[PDB]
Amino acid sequence: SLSRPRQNYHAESESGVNKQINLELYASYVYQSMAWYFDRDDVALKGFHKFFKKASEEEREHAEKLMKFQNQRGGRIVLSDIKRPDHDEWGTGLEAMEVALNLEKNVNQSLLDLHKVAEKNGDDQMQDWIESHFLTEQVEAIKELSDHITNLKRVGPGLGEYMFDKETLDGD
Amino acid sequence: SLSRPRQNYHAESESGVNKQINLELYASYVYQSMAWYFDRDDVALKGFHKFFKKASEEEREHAEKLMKFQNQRGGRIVLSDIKRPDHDEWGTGLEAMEVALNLEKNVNQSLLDLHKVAEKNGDDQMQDWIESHFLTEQVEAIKELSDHITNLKRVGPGLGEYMFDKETLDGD
Amino acid sequence: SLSRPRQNYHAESESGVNKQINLELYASYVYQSMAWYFDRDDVALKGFHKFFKKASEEEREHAEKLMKFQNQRGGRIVLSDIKRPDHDEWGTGLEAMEVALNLEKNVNQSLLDLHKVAEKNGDDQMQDWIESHFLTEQVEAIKELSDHITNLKRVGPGLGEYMFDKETLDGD
Amino acid sequence: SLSRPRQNYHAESESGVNKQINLELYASYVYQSMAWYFDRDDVALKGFHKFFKKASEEEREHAEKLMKFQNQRGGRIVLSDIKRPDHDEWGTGLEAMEVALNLEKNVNQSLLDLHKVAEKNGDDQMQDWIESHFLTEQVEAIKELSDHITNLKRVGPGLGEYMFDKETLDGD
Amino acid sequence: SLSRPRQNYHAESESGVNKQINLELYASYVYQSMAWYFDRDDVALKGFHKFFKKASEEEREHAEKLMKFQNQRGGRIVLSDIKRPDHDEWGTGLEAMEVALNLEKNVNQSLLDLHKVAEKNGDDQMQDWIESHFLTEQVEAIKELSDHITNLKRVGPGLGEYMFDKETLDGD
Amino acid sequence: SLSRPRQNYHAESESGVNKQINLELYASYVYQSMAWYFDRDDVALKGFHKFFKKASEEEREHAEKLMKFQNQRGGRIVLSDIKRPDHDEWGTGLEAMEVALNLEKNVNQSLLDLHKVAEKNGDDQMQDWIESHFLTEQVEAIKELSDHITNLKRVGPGLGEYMFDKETLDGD
Ligand SMILES: [Mg+2]
Ligand SMILES: [Mg+2]
Ligand SMILES: [Mg+2]
Ligand SMILES: [Mg+2]
Ligand SMILES: [Mg+2]
Ligand SMILES: [Mg+2]
Ligand SMILES: [Mg+2]
Ligand SMILES: [Mg+2]
Ligand SMILES: [Mg+2]
Ligand SMILES: [Mg+2]
Ligand SMILES: [Mg+2]
Ligand SMILES: [Mg+2]
Ligand SMILES: [Mg+2]
Ligand SMILES: [Mg+2]
Ligand SMILES: [Mg+2]
Ligand SMILES: [Mg+2]
């Protein structure tokens, strides 16, 4: 029995939105782990803390954008376990930014794959929605992380990392 | 002799925009009929009146969005009779909301069909225009009507219908 | 079974209000056709566009004044097809103003005929209502269109039409 | 090698804070599931939606209070999988409030158990911290849910549930 | 060695963005030539001057939108000579507006061709970006130039051209 | 047939102004290339980006100052191809500032050479105009670039370049 709103919305698209929901929540958890790693007394970079804390809140917003979309189209949210991140510790500011870029590139591919499911099933509204909410925001996030990685390599460790935290990440 | 602006704009697309203009004007007329039905002394629901009056004005705005688009692309507006609605009377608030949802789903399909004409003829700008102006607005309208139908069934007839008119539709 | 409000309201008057509703909606559609004709890239007169767009919205307001009146007196709105206008194209600014005047004079007669139905059936309130809402507004509209026609003949075609659009119709 | 801040902070307390972090994140996920269930077109209670959405954000704040505390005391955050909730669907507003109360009572016990670990290990600051941040907030949350359950039983299903959503939960 | 941001970005798309950069800069130079032609003591139309000066600045902004896009996607800007325009002199206001429309239609085709390269290579983000930034803006620019050409033919040479400069182009 | 304004304005001066127009536009293009090089994900210096972007806009303003001057004196603007810059890549912040200084010194000589043409032909107004608009502005630009080069050598590569971008160029 099809939900009352449902029109031009395919079971593969509905299932793909649930898979993207879990990935956004997973990315939220990775950024949360990194945020609180930078609050450790033996790491102590408030800029990096604030940056990954905000990244974590944004990913949970992405998850909730997809939950609202699922309900708009008359699909049904199915939640899965949010897997713990692969590491308890995240190294230097540079190493954490590289992990961030690799995560954002994996989320980007997964969004393009979900756009392909929409396209395969003739879902013109879902393709446009993914384009409006996600595809350009992911390009912007990937360029920003690439800029940060270039600058963290330019400033180098020690004082450089500290000044990057103060200047680019507005630490404090 | 092609109009001065005309570029990548197919006769099938031009004709499809005229057909969508008439459908938007038709939907405007159905909502107008329902609006003034709720102003009857023997129906007397100001919330429902205000809701369908606004829906009617929006559909005429949709019609005028398509008239402006036709002229932008160098096509020519051709108007047809606006058929009277299928009923003089529209029953209960619940029955009118169900008629609304069925109308919005028929307008939605017709917009996806017009997007398919654009796509078939390689009209990338017209596909994006339909996506920006219509496809997401239709999804939102269909979800809102589905929410209203669920709530009108929850509150039930009599006092429930009255309180829905006061609370959700801000009657008065 | 007479509606609860109904007092001194004759079946001929009720039927005449439904006929005037359709005529107001028809006039609305003619003005809408002319409005969007003046938005064509090959006509391109923003003053004329704005003038007929406003005329169109006013005629739909007239239609809704009569719908409210029908319900006030305990009559029942019966909607008919809104016939498409007699032309797709409307010529020069002067030619469109002459079509406007001829339409307003036909709506005026039809209002005087409806006033005669009210009078024949002793409906003192309906005669006064038509006088308050319509008869003087029609005289004003006819005088304004006659003034515009005189001025469009004075300024002549080409630059004159352009300056009339800028000065009298406040184009832009 | 003990972290630089660490003083009077026992391995059992550190491990108990990580277990409470996962429970707060779990409760956050249950409230998130319930929030978006109430946004379904076939459930459509904006008050319940807003209430569980806020409850979800608060539980994630609780999780982050414990992450900050772990780092303050020189312990180390260890994250585990956030288990999916036990249900995809949550029934009536009344049924969801009862699930909420049962969850808050299980989180409450778990906080008293964590306070007992602190007490067993002579951690006077950690006992006071749990008292300041959690023990009274849990009593308040449990009393509020008990009040809501009493009122949802008083108003009854259908119109009652709708009016509770409008009046007590400020729906819209 | 692929740049750090690069994902789903094809060499044909990168090369097409460099070709569109040069075309936008070329169009900027044509509008600049026309702007300063209208500042000649023997042409002296401040409205036309201001209009083509703004058109020139906008085209250079288009060029810079594509430079930012190239860098966002991890491609590399390659600049070519900006060819001088085909004429030193641009005739009447009407003749310059017709040259403008022909230029905007050639830039429009070139944007649709670049969208086709994006589409051929499955670049969903680049297609949406071209749609958001360019395809509708080009339709609007072409309709405006078509409107101006219609009006410059309506007003005729001499006084008409002067009044068009004062009224539509706000000369001074 | 001499233009109506022309007085004491020599063909050599008119031709020299057209040559300076092309040089200013060339310098604009070099600064634009350098601006967008500093926006590359693998260069990523917002201060340098903003500095060369502004330098580029100023050089195009210089070009337009000379176009206005040509028309004031009754000469005729003749535009040539704007040659692409000699490099796609511009190295370190220090290397780009040295390229800037060398460009500004070549533009300076070319302005003194144009002043000599004015002087040779007794054009007292054109000599004063070049003095007022250009000769002191070039001295100021050359001193500023020399100061920046001294400071980029003082701070050294890596962190020094980053801090120069933040402090002297107000990056962000
Ligand atoms: Mg995300
Ligand atoms: Mg794809
Ligand atoms: Mg699209
Ligand atoms: Mg868009
Ligand atoms: Mg519509
Ligand atoms: Mg389709
Ligand atoms: Mg009327
Ligand atoms: Mg009479
Ligand atoms: Mg009176
Ligand atoms: Mg909690
Ligand atoms: Mg105890
Ligand atoms: Mg352009
Ligand atoms: Mg195409
Ligand atoms: Mg210069
Ligand atoms: Mg000298
Ligand atoms: Mg001097």
Author numbering:
A (entry chain A), B (entry chain A), C (entry chain A), D (entry chain A), E (entry chain A), F (entry chain A): 2 to 173
Sentences from the paper on this structure:
For marine invertebrates with no adaptive immune system, ferritin is a major intracellular iron‐storage protein with a critical role in innate immunity. Here, we present the crystal structures of two novel ferritins [Fer147 and Phascolosoma esculenta ferritin (PeFer)] from the marine invertebrate P. esculenta, which resides in muddy‐bottom coastal regions. Fer147 and PeFer exhibit the 4‐3‐2 symmetry of cage‐like hollow shells containing 24 subunits, similar to other known ferritins. Fer147 and PeFer contain both the conserved ferroxidase center and threefold channels.
Subtle structural differences in the putative nucleation sites suggest possible routes of metal ion movement in the protein shells. However, the marked variation in the electrostatic potential of the threefold channels in Fer147 and the fourfold channels in PeFer suggests significant diversity between Fer147 and PeFer in terms of metal ion aggregation and cation exclusion.
